Amino acid sequence: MSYEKEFLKDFEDWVKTQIQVNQLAMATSQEVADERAKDAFIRYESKLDAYEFLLGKFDNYKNGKAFHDIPDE
Amino acid sequence: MSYEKEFLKDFEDWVKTQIQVNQLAMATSQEVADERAKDAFIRYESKLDAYEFLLGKFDNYKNGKAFHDIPDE
Protein backbone atom coordinates (compact mmCIF):
# COMPACT_ATOMS: atom_id res chain seq x y z
CA MET A 1 0.00 0.00 0.00
CA SER A 2 1.10 3.53 -0.83
CA TYR A 3 1.06 6.28 1.80
CA GLU A 4 -2.37 7.53 0.68
CA LYS A 5 -3.90 4.06 0.83
CA GLU A 6 -2.58 3.32 4.30
CA PHE A 7 -3.74 6.73 5.45
CA LEU A 8 -7.25 6.03 4.10
CA LYS A 9 -7.27 2.66 5.84
CA ASP A 10 -6.22 4.01 9.25
CA PHE A 11 -8.73 6.79 8.73
CA GLU A 12 -11.57 4.29 8.19
CA ASP A 13 -10.59 2.13 11.19
CA TRP A 14 -10.52 5.27 13.31
CA VAL A 15 -14.06 6.16 12.23
CA LYS A 16 -15.26 2.62 12.99
CA THR A 17 -13.63 3.00 16.43
CA GLN A 18 -15.44 6.29 17.08
CA ILE A 19 -18.75 4.69 16.08
CA GLN A 20 -18.25 1.94 18.67
CA VAL A 21 -17.08 4.51 21.20
CA ASN A 22 -20.13 6.72 20.76
CA GLN A 23 -22.64 3.89 20.47
CA LEU A 24 -21.74 2.63 23.94
CA ALA A 25 -21.62 6.10 25.54
CA MET A 26 -24.89 6.86 23.77
CA ALA A 27 -26.58 3.65 24.89
CA THR A 28 -25.14 4.09 28.38
CA SER A 29 -26.50 7.60 28.87
CA GLN A 30 -29.81 7.03 27.06
CA GLU A 31 -30.17 4.36 29.73
CA VAL A 32 -30.56 7.10 32.33
CA ALA A 33 -32.43 9.69 30.24
CA ASP A 34 -31.73 14.86 34.05
CA GLU A 35 -30.88 17.48 31.40
CA ARG A 36 -27.35 16.13 31.71
CA ALA A 37 -28.04 12.62 30.45
CA LYS A 38 -30.12 13.91 27.56
CA ASP A 39 -27.51 16.51 26.64
CA ALA A 40 -24.90 13.72 26.70
CA PHE A 41 -27.05 11.41 24.58
CA ILE A 42 -27.54 14.21 22.04
CA ARG A 43 -23.79 14.90 21.99
CA TYR A 44 -22.96 11.27 21.36
CA GLU A 45 -25.73 10.54 18.87
CA SER A 46 -24.72 13.67 16.94
CA LYS A 47 -21.18 12.34 16.62
CA LEU A 48 -22.40 8.88 15.66
CA ASP A 49 -24.49 10.46 12.91
CA ALA A 50 -21.44 12.25 11.46
CA TYR A 51 -19.31 9.10 11.63
CA GLU A 52 -22.00 6.89 10.14
CA PHE A 53 -22.11 9.29 7.17
CA LEU A 54 -18.32 9.12 6.78
CA LEU A 55 -18.53 5.32 6.70
CA GLY A 56 -20.56 5.85 3.55
CA LYS A 57 -17.76 7.90 1.98
CA PHE A 58 -15.23 5.14 2.60
CA ASP A 59 -17.60 2.81 0.77
CA ASN A 60 -17.34 5.16 -2.20
CA TYR A 61 -13.55 4.82 -1.98
CA LYS A 62 -13.63 1.02 -1.80
CA ASN A 63 -15.86 1.20 -4.88
CA GLY A 64 -13.73 3.67 -6.86
CA LYS A 65 -16.47 6.32 -6.83
CA ALA A 66 -15.84 10.03 -6.41
CA PHE A 67 -16.17 11.36 -2.87
CA HIS A 68 -19.41 13.30 -3.47
CA ASP A 69 -21.26 10.27 -4.89
CA ILE A 70 -24.06 8.61 -2.91
CA PRO A 71 -23.23 5.23 -1.23
CA ASP A 72 -25.03 1.95 -1.98
CA GLU A 73 -27.52 0.42 0.47
CA MET B 1 -3.35 13.72 -8.76
CA SER B 2 -4.05 10.01 -8.35
CA TYR B 3 -7.48 8.76 -7.31
CA GLU B 4 -6.48 8.56 -3.63
CA LYS B 5 -5.11 12.10 -3.60
CA GLU B 6 -8.20 13.60 -5.22
CA PHE B 7 -10.38 11.63 -2.83
CA LEU B 8 -8.42 12.99 0.15
CA LYS B 9 -8.75 16.51 -1.21
CA ASP B 10 -12.52 16.34 -1.75
CA PHE B 11 -12.75 14.74 1.67
CA GLU B 12 -10.96 17.69 3.30
CA ASP B 13 -13.03 20.32 1.46
CA TRP B 14 -16.17 18.49 2.57
CA VAL B 15 -15.03 18.65 6.21
CA LYS B 16 -14.26 22.37 5.89
CA THR B 17 -17.76 22.80 4.44
CA GLN B 18 -19.36 20.98 7.39
CA ILE B 19 -17.41 23.16 9.82
CA GLN B 20 -18.82 26.31 8.19
CA VAL B 21 -22.26 24.71 8.06
CA ASN B 22 -22.28 23.82 11.74
CA GLN B 23 -20.63 27.02 12.94
CA LEU B 24 -23.47 29.11 11.51
CA ALA B 25 -26.24 26.79 12.72
CA MET B 26 -24.47 26.68 16.09
CA ALA B 27 -24.08 30.45 16.33
CA THR B 28 -27.64 30.92 15.07
CA SER B 29 -29.22 28.68 17.69
CA GLN B 30 -26.91 29.68 20.56
CA GLU B 31 -28.32 33.10 19.75
CA VAL B 32 -31.68 31.98 21.12
CA ALA B 33 -30.49 29.69 23.92
CA ASP B 34 -36.01 26.60 25.21
CA GLU B 35 -34.68 23.03 25.55
CA ARG B 36 -34.91 22.96 21.76
CA ALA B 37 -32.36 25.67 21.04
CA LYS B 38 -29.91 24.23 23.55
CA ASP B 39 -30.38 20.71 22.21
CA ALA B 40 -29.73 22.08 18.71
CA PHE B 41 -26.64 24.00 19.84
CA ILE B 42 -25.30 20.82 21.47
CA ARG B 43 -26.00 18.82 18.31
CA TYR B 44 -24.16 21.30 16.12
CA GLU B 45 -21.25 21.96 18.45
CA SER B 46 -20.78 18.20 18.82
CA LYS B 47 -20.45 17.87 15.05
CA LEU B 48 -18.11 20.85 14.84
CA ASP B 49 -15.91 19.21 17.47
CA ALA B 50 -15.65 16.00 15.41
CA TYR B 51 -14.90 17.91 12.21
CA GLU B 52 -12.36 20.18 13.85
CA PHE B 53 -10.51 17.04 14.99
CA LEU B 54 -10.59 15.61 11.46
CA LEU B 55 -9.06 18.84 10.15
CA GLY B 56 -6.10 17.91 12.31
CA LYS B 57 -5.80 14.52 10.60
CA PHE B 58 -5.67 16.13 7.17
CA ASP B 59 -2.80 18.25 8.48
CA ASN B 60 -0.99 15.00 9.27
CA TYR B 61 -1.56 13.96 5.65
CA LYS B 62 -0.30 17.25 4.21
CA ASN B 63 2.76 16.72 6.42
CA GLY B 64 3.38 13.07 5.50
CA LYS B 65 2.71 11.88 9.06
CA ALA B 66 0.86 8.70 9.94
CA PHE B 67 -2.85 9.11 10.67
CA HIS B 68 -2.60 8.45 14.42
CA ASP B 69 0.08 11.13 14.96
CA ILE B 70 -0.75 14.35 16.82
CA PRO B 71 -1.14 17.55 14.67
CA ASP B 72 1.02 20.66 15.05
CA GLU B 73 -0.33 23.85 16.65
CA pair distance A56, A19, nearest whole angstrom: 13
Q: Searching chain B, which residue's CA lies closest to the CA of residue A10?
A: B67
Residues 6 or more apart in contact with residue B67 via CB below 8 angstroms = A6, A7, A10, A11, A14, B57, B60, B61
Domains of chain A: 1-73 (1.20.58.90)
Side chain identity at residue B8, one-letter code: L
Query: Which method resolved this structure?
Result: X-ray
| Per-window interface: A 1-40 vs B, CB < 8 A | 2-8, 10-11, 14, 18, 35, 38-39
Asked if A47 reaches chain B (Cβ–Cβ under 8 Å), the answer is: yes
CB contact under 8 A, A64 and B3: yes
